[PDB]
Amino acid sequence: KRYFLMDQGDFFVHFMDLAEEELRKPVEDITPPRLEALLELALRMSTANTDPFKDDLKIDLMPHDLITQLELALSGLEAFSFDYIVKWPLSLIINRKALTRYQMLFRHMFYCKHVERQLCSVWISNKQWFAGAFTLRQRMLNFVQNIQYYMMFEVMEPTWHILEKNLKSASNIDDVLGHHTGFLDTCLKDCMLTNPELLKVFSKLMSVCVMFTNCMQKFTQSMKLLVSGFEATINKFDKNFSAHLLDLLARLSIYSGMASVISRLDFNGFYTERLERL
Amino acid sequence: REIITLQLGQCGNQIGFEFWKQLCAEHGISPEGIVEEFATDRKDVFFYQADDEHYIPRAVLLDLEPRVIHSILNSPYAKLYNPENIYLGNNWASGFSQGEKIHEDIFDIIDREADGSDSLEGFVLCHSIAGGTGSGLGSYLLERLNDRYPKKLVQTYSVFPNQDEDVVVQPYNSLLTLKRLTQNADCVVVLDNTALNRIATDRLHIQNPSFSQINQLVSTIMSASTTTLRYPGYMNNDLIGLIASLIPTPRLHFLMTGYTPLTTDKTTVLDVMRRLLQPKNVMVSTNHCYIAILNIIQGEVDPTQVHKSLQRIRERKLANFIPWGPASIQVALSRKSPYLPSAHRVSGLMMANHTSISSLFERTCRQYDKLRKREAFLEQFRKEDMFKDNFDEMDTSREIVQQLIDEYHAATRPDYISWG
Amino acid sequence: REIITLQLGQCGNQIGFEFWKQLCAEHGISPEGIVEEFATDRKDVFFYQADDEHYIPRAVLLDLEPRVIHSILNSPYAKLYNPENIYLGNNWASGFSQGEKIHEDIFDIIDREADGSDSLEGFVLCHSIAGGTGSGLGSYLLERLNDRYPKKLVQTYSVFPNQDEDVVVQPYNSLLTLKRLTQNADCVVVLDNTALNRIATDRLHIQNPSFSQINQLVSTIMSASTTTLRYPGYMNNDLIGLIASLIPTPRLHFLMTGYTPLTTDKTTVLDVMRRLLQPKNVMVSTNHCYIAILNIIQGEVDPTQVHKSLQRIRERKLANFIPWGPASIQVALSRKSPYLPSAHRVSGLMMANHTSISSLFERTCRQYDKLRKREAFLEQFRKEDMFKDNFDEMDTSREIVQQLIDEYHAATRPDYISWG
Amino acid sequence: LDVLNKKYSLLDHMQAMRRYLLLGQGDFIRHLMDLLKPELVRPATTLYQHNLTGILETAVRATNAQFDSPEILRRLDVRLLEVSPGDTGWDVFSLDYHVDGPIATVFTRECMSHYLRVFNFLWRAKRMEYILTDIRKGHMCNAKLLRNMPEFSGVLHQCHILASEMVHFIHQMQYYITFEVLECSWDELWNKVQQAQDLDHIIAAHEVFLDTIISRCLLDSDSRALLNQLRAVFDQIIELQNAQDAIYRAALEELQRRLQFEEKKKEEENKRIGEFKESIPKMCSQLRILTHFYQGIVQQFLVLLTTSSDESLRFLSFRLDFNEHYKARE
Numbered sequence A: 001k002r003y004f005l006m007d008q009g010d011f012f013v014h015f016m017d018l019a020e021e022e023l024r025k026p027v028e029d030i031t032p033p034r035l036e037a038l039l040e041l042a043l044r045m046s047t048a049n050t051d052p053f054k055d056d057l058k059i060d061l062m063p064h065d066l067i068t069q070l071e072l073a074l075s076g077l078e079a080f081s082f083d084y085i086v087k088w089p090l091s092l093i094i095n096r097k098a099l100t101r102y103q104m105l106f107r108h109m110f111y112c113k114h115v116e117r118q119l120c121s122v123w124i125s126n127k128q129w130f131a132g133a134f135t136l137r138q139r140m141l142n143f144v145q146n147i148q149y150y151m152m153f154e155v156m157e158p159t160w161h162i163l164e165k166n167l168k169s170a171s172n173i174d175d176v177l178g179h180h181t182g183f184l185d186t187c188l189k190d191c192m193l194t195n196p197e198l199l200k201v202f203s204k205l206m207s208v209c210v211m212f213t214n215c216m217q218k219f220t221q222s223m224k225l226l227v228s229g230f231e232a233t234i235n236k237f238d239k240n241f242s243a244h245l246l247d248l249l250a251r252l253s254i255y256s257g258m259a260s261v262i263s264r265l266d267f268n269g270f271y272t273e274r275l276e277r278l
Numbered sequence B, C: 001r002e003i004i005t006l007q008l009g010q011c012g013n014q015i016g017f018e019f020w021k022q023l024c025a026e027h028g029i030s031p032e033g034i035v036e037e038f039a040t041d042r043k044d045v046f047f048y049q050a051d052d053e054h055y056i057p058r059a060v061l062l063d064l065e066p067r068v069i070h071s072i073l074n075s076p077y078a079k080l081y082n083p084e085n086i087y088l089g090n091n092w093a094s095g096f097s098q099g100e101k102i103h104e105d106i107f108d109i110i111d112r113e114a115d116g117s118d119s120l121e122g123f124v125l126c127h128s129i130a131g132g133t134g135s136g137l138g139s140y141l142l143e144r145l146n147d148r149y150p151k152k153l154v155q156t157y158s159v160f161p162n163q164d165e166d167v168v169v170q171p172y173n174s175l176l177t178l179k180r181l182t183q184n185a186d187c188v189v190v191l192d193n194t195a196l197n198r199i200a201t202d203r204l205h206i207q208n209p210s211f212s213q214i215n216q217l218v219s220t221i222m223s224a225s226t227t228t229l230r231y232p233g234y235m236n237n238d239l240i241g242l243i244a245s246l247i248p249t250p251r252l253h254f255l256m257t258g259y260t261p262l263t264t265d266k267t268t269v270l271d272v273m274r275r276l277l278q279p280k281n282v283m284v285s286t287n288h289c290y291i292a293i294l295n296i297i298q299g300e301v302d303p304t305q306v307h308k309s310l311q312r313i314r315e316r317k318l319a320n321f322i323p324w325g326p327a328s329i330q331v332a333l334s335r336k337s338p339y340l341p342s343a344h345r346v347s348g349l350m351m352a353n354h355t356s357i358s359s360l361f362e363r364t365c366r367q368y369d370k371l372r373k374r375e376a377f378l379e380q381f382r383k384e385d386m387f388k389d390n391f392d393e394m395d396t397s398r399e400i401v402q403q404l405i406d407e408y409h410a411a412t413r414p415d416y417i418s419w420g
Numbered sequence D: 001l002d003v004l005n006k007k008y009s010l011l012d013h014m015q016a017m018r019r020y021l022l023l024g025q026g027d028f029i030r031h032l033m034d035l036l037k038p039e040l041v042r043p044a045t046t047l048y049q050h051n052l053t054g055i056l057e058t059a060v061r062a063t064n065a066q067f068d069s070p071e072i073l074r075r076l077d078v079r080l081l082e083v084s085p086g087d088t089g090w091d092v093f094s095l096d097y098h099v100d101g102p103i104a105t106v107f108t109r110e111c112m113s114h115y116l117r118v119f120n121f122l123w124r125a126k127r128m129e130y131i132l133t134d135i136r137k138g139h140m141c142n143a144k145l146l147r148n149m150p151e152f153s154g155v156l157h158q159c160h161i162l163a164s165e166m167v168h169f170i171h172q173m174q175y176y177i178t179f180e181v182l183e184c185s186w187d188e189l190w191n192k193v194q195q196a197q198d199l200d201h202i203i204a205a206h207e208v209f210l211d212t213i214i215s216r217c218l219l220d221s222d223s224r225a226l227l228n229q230l231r232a233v234f235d236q237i238i239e240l241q242n243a244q245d246a247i248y249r250a251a252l253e254e255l256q257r258r259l260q261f262e263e264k265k266k267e268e269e270n271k272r273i274g275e276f277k278e279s280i281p282k283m284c285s286q287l288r289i290l291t292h293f294y295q296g297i298v299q300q301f302l303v304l305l306t307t308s309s310d311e312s313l314r315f316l317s318f319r320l321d322f323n324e325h326y327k328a329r330e
């Protein structure tokens, strides 16, 4: 959990940027020795250098990423996957089926952390600066920071306290195998990884968010080094965002820890009533 | 992401002295900076690591006509802060001019620490607005830092001066500080002497020694505003991430404070949240509405309850805000530290972007506008006149702060998409 | 081959006395030079093996206007150093002239030891730059040694003097010493009075008795620089081998120092390395870059860890190196000695060729250039004028040191492959 | 194990084997190389074993090796190799450490043979480094008396840089052998041996220390191809030993006559400037082709060590390319 559910973010703040300049490069152009040394270093740098089994983490690649899940050349935040080593004794509980999904949880949770800081980075560069950007960036950031407060404090720390509680009161190793797969399926399903179309709508939201920060940072670099190009992108990006933001809350209102998402996403009645479906 | 703090001016040096002392006991550090034998935290950002575990804060202490910088030196904690970097009027112009001659040696002291650190995420300033020497010197140093370090974001735990209105030029000094602060500060956390003095009268009988006791109040807020950074947590480890959500529009870069157990000396999350939105727990003194809000908690907090608690304030609607945007509120849960008392097992604060703070800015602008017509205190001191013969920076400041006063109220309106 | 140390001048004799005493306790030797009963080291190089088992050091002690040479004699260690070889102004010219009349008897004392030893690899001078008697006498003896021993190499533990700038002729004396040192010394290890004084202020409160306490600091570096030779190892088992990697081009031979636990009074290799690259651990006071770096560690070091520790320093990119051809950080491991305390079980030192030291040379050249125009202190003492009527050795020295100042900055450039 | 540890001292024999046959002491070997140069450089077809034994005796007295148990100090003996034709003592000279008795079961005929391959390699690249330190002894010890001549520095500078770049490559490989083939292997052998109980865990494990050194070094039948390229560097080092000296005894030669030309004064030296101005281009081009040939071999060598196993090749490749001087198109 320290490296898969990101409880020790101290390690992630140090590791993220120390490898990013390499991560932005595509696959077949990335050297596992370089990433390995960089993680090996980041682990020593972090306050999390007190865990006995810290050595276990290894940097591997997920081929096809979430596509294999029911571009590959694209990499960095895109193709990163941790993997943990276990011997025969405890391999019998923490196995392939268990660690295939802990990784698949960590990967989705990495993008939410990675692109929140990309939106934060574009906001640092701007620090005459027409507001076209400030409207849309305030919208995406206040939407995402809230998804990451729901994911880490409405699903994970909740269910993990179910697992630590029930594994304290099992009396057999076919029942400990019951709780472990029970906690893992609960956090995978309650979180938005388990949707019939798998919430590709969340992926489309994250594509417009990255395309926005890309050009916005590029333009602010370009103007430093006016609205016919910028405000044109600002209006179209804000219009596509408001459309997908509303589509997400609408397609999540159809379901009936169920509405704690939408009730929260529109907290203090903002966008709570805009258009009633059908 | 090590962050340096540029504590400056007698008042600013007093709250940096205490803030570092507060993190001395809270963290595993003694008065000589030695790792405590009795002692899980991220001491890297705030504390430099010496070879023999002398965790020395990266504090930059600036003195000028020194008196209390001498009292800071005769302390048990003199060894704790030894980057060996301390370098030798009541007018804003008087402070700005003194800073300009010594700018390069104070700026080299900034460089030394920047070179020494693996990296530098940001700078933190402790000073009082209209702080005599503290203001003017602080505005000038605010202007130099952005040009040298555009990436670096400077955050000032401003000691905004509100004492029921001695400084006869106080409005003029404050007016100039904000103009620099509005265009040359990435973020500002506002505090009020009267608001805290009113809290001091409320929680305690202390009235006459308001400055000494209120130092502890400013400190509890200051240590608390950074605890998500100082102790690793799922979110808000970096300073940039912690603030960006609080300020939606660059110009509106001023944050309000509050603390649920002002008398921290069990409680469910549903309770500590409702208590905070109430206005006694707030420490700051036409419709008006918070632009965006976010809660901070550190104690024995259940994890299923906070969502029920979030939903509770959604129904209670105790605090009201209506930005055309969907800024809403955010939640935060962190670990209370061991060793120090665990009283008020659940203790937390809230940071809230609010349009009410515009009113405090307008009150000093009101005193200044009244004072400007009278020209009762133009100082006309040769420093003041020779530095400013036109006296037009005050008018430049007046239009910039009026734009800010206007922008805030525009935020209240339904159309901040159009210019405000 | 055995090393003979020509300690000269009052300052040089004091550091020389502290260094032999430091290896007295560190090695199995008592104050009478007798093998200690309580006592695996290569004592052959530094210590002569006598018939009484006295470990007489191969040390040559030169006294001029003796005062601190008499105090050296009234010591418990007077018996320890008994090669029975000690032989009887504040101006560089005054020292050079005094040395010339007694050159043959001091030179026979050099011969005696050379004949007595199985062999003689090099001469290690505890030289004092602008040392009054120590400089001038030291430059002259530096010139005689190379001519008599072309094959043998000369190193100098120069205590370059920086005291914030009493000697009014200090720049003139220093200027002359370097010209001799740049053309007549195979190696030089630079130390700085201010850099160590700043360290003394940092680690301790000692300020007024800076010279007595700083001796210990110079000593720890001086014992440490030789520990790979004084104790056996798989590599660096000879003085020239350490000297080769540290000085790539014949003209540029000045070495910077550093020590990881300056407060040596567990730690992984990964940590003792980075601690060293930081500038507080350094003891010396346009792009700039190191030419080649080396490090030696003596303690409980997992021999396996160093094989990946070099890669760890490589990733942090803490250091910027030479740009023309290749150069790299070098990792070496030695044994800490038994008997003496094992505090800071792991503790390290670094010797590096850095272009920053050019700046210290230019500062004395700056004081001298300013002083030369004024001619405020030409001495015009008859010794000074009669010895130097033309006063053109100072100008010869000025062009030679300027060539060195130029050569260093040429090293920073991409084309030192072209003539520099 | 209690009666083989004491009466037959398997512990002290394997402990001092690293020190003397793997150059673990070093001091003894550098003292041995110092006294044994004249005889080894001389064709050893005239040389015989008794002289080598006698020099080794006083050499042991010179080093701290004499401060050990007399038995192990006596077992060591110089071994002649086949007397290779047209050869110099340097090509055919290796210590043996003849061992007989019960200790033989741990150290068999197979064990001493594999140690001799290690020794054949370590003697070459302990000399080649002591040759390059003599080079740097010379560059430092010739330039200190040519401080008057300004015409020479240019060709002198081109000789120094290539000499420095060579010391960067051999000195680093010396560290890689020091801590990545002979410290981590010995650490692995020691722990697996001293925790053992069955003597069968001491034999089948000690052979693993042996059969891992031969693969972390380049002595294996597969790493031989990379050694074949390493030989070219081990050749180009002594190639400079002949390129450098042939210039000084020619260049320095004129300087001695220039003192004697002025000792005549106390037009001939205008013809010596003539031989200088025509000699500078040929020496310049000869040294230039040497640097390009050295770059052409070392760059092909570094690109030769591409990953096969990566157990021991990645931590040397990093060492040879640190500061990215190479791989930046040099």
Ligand SMILES: Nc1nc2c(ncn2[C@@H]2O[C@H](COP(=O)(O)OP(=O)(O)O)[C@@H](O)[C@H]2O)c(=O)[nH]1
Pocket (backbone or CB within 6 Å): B009, B010, B011, B014, B089, B090, B128, B129, B130, B131, B132, B133, B134, B159, B160, B161, B162, B163, B193, B211, B212, B214, B215, B218
């Ligand atoms: N919060 C707080 N503010 C203080 C304290 N002491 C002084 N101040 C404020 O400092 C401001 C004046 O700064 P001043 O002390 O004159 O700075 P000086 O010019 O260095 O003396 C006033 O606005 C006060 O509100 C203190 O202990 N706590």
Ligand SMILES: Nc1nc2c(ncn2[C@@H]2O[C@H](COP(=O)(O)OP(=O)(O)O)[C@@H](O)[C@H]2O)c(=O)[nH]1
Pocket (backbone or CB within 6 Å): C009, C010, C011, C014, C015, C089, C090, C128, C129, C130, C131, C132, C133, C134, C159, C161, C162, C163, C193, C211, C212, C214, C215, C218
């Ligand atoms: N490192 C060190 N330097 C010293 C000490 N005492 C004197 N010096 C240096 O010696 C230089 C002057 O040499 P001096 O003692 O006058 O030689 P004298 O003429 O024989 O007395 C100054 O530049 C001092 O920095 C000492 O204890 N330690």
